[PDB]
C-alpha cells in the first residue's frame, strides 16, 4: 500500500 | 488523559523556484510528521491502518500549520524548515501569489496578530490529526473521543492562560475552516506540478499523492 | 447586540434528474437567502457592496448548512426546500454519490445525533456569513467583530440551554472545517455542470457562478 | 456587476 508511511509508522 | 504539557512537549522536539524549494521541504518535514504524530498521545495506539488514515488526510493541513505559525515574525514571506525565507515577492513572481497571500492574510497575520502560542499550535494540530471524518477508519468513535479531549483541554489551557481573553478558544477553531480550504487548494497545486512534469516531487511527498486503495 | 432569539427569528421567518432538482431549489433558496440574511443583526448596515461580497462567498456553505439541517429527521437522503426527498440511492444513480454521502455522513447525521437546534444551526449559518476572510471587505475588522458578537452569544445559548454539555459549543463550531470543504466539492460539481451545458442553470445561480471584478 | 444580488440587496 503506502509503503513509506507504514515503514515509519511501523519502526 | 490529553495533557497539553504533553503536546507541547510534540511540538518542541519537532523544531527544526520557490516551488520546488516548498515542495523540496515538504518532503523533508513529512518525515518529522511522522515522528510528531508518534509523541501526541494515544495516537500510536491506534491501529497501524488509521495511524496511516489519519496522515494521510491531514498531512497538508499540519504542515501549513506549521510553517505558518514559525513564520510570525516574518513579514510578507514564510520561513521554511530548511532555514529558507520566502517573500510575498518571490511567490508571485512563481505564480502562486495568491494561495500566498490567503495564507499570509488568513493564517500567519491572524497567528501574529493573537500571538497563538505553541501549546494552541499544538493543540489545533493534533485535532486536525484526530479528525474524525476521514474515511476508512476502522473506529471513527474512538478518534472522535481523542479530538474531544484535546479540545477540552485546549479550552481549559487558553481560559487558565489568558483569562482576560473569553473568546480565545473559539478564535483557535475559527481558523480550521480557513487552513481547511488553503490546505486543498495548496493539494490543487501540487497535483498541477505532478502534472506538468516540471518541479522535482520526492518519494514521501509523490507518495501521499498516491491513490488510497479504495 | 447580537440576540440569539433575532437569529432564530431569521431562521423561523424562512422556512418553507436528481441534480436537476437540487439546482433548481439551489436557485429557489437564494432569493430566500437574501431575506434571511436582511434579518439578521447589523447585516444591512453594512455597505452595499461588503453585503453582496459575503453572500456571494457563503452562500453555498450556507444553503448547505440549511438543507443538511432540514434533512435530520430523514433517513438516508435530504429534503429540498421544494418539498422532494432526495435518497442517497438516487444520488448514487446520478454519479453524485460522493458528495452525496459526505454530506449524510459529515453533516446531517452529525446534526442529528447531537440535535442541533435551530437556534445553534442559525448562529453557525451566522458565523458562515459574517467571513472576515472574503477578498475585497472595505472593513473586514467590522465583519469580525459581528462574527465574534455571534459565537459569544451562540456559547452564552449552549451553556445556558445545555449546562450538562460543556462541549457542545466547540462541537458546534468543528463542523466548520467540513462544511468548508464539503461547500468547495460542491461548487467544483456545479462548475462541471455548467460546463458540460447539461443540466439547466436558472438566473441566480448562474449569476453566482459569474466571475467576481477582480 | 452582480446584477441580480444587488436589485435584492438595495429593496
Ligand atoms: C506554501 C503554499 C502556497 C504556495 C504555492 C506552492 C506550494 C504548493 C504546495 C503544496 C503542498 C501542500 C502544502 C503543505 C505543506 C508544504 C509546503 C510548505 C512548506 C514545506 C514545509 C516547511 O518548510 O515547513
Ligand atoms: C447536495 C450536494 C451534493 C450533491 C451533488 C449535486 C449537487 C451539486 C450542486 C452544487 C451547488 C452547491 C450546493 C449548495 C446548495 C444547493 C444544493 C442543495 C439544495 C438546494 C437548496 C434546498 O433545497 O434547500
Given at each position: 500500500k503506502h509503503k513509506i508511511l507504514h515503514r515509519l509508522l511501523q519502526d | 488523559d490529553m495533557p497539553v504539557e504533553r503536546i507541547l512537549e510534540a511540538e518542541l522536539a519537532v523544531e527544526p523556484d520557490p516551488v520546488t524549494n516548498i515542495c523540496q521541504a515538504a518532503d523533508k518535514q513529512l518525515f518529522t510528521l511522522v515522528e510528531w504524530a508518534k509523541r501526541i498521545p494515544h495516537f500510536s495506539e491506534l491501529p497501524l491502518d488509521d495511524q496511516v488514515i489519519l496522515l494521510r488526510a491531514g498531512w497538508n493541513e499540519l504542515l501549513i500549520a506549521s510553517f505558518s505559525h514559525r513564520s510570525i515574525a516574518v513579514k510578507d514571506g514564510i520561513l521554511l524548515a530548511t532555514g529558507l525565507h520566502v517573500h510575498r515577492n518571490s511567490a508571485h513572481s512563481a505564480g502562486v501569489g495568491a494561495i500566498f497571500d490567503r495564507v499570509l492574510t488568513e493564517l500567519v497575520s491572524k497567528m501574529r496578530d493573537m500571538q497563538m502560542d505553541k501549546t494552541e499550535l499544538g493543540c489545533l494540530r493534533a485535532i486536525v490529526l484526530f479528525n474524525?471524518?476521514?474515511?476508512?477508519?476502522?473506529?471513527?468513535a474512538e478518534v472522535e473521543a481523542l479530538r474531544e479531549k484535546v479540545y477540552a483541554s485546549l479550552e481549559a489551557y487558553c481560559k487558565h492562560?489568558?483569562?482576560?481573553?473569553?473568546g480565545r478558544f473559539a478564535k483557535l477553531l475559527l481558523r480550521l475552516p480557513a487552513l481547511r480550504s488553503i490546505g486543498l487548494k495548496c493539494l490543487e497545486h501540487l497535483f498541477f506540478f505532478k502534472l506538468i512534469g516540471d518541479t522535482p516531487i520526492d518519494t514521501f511527498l509523490m507518495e501521499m499523492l498516491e491513490a488510497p486503495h479504495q
Open positions: - | 474524525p471524518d476521514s474515511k476508512g477508519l476502522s473506529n471513527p492562560k489568558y483569562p482576560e481573553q473569553p
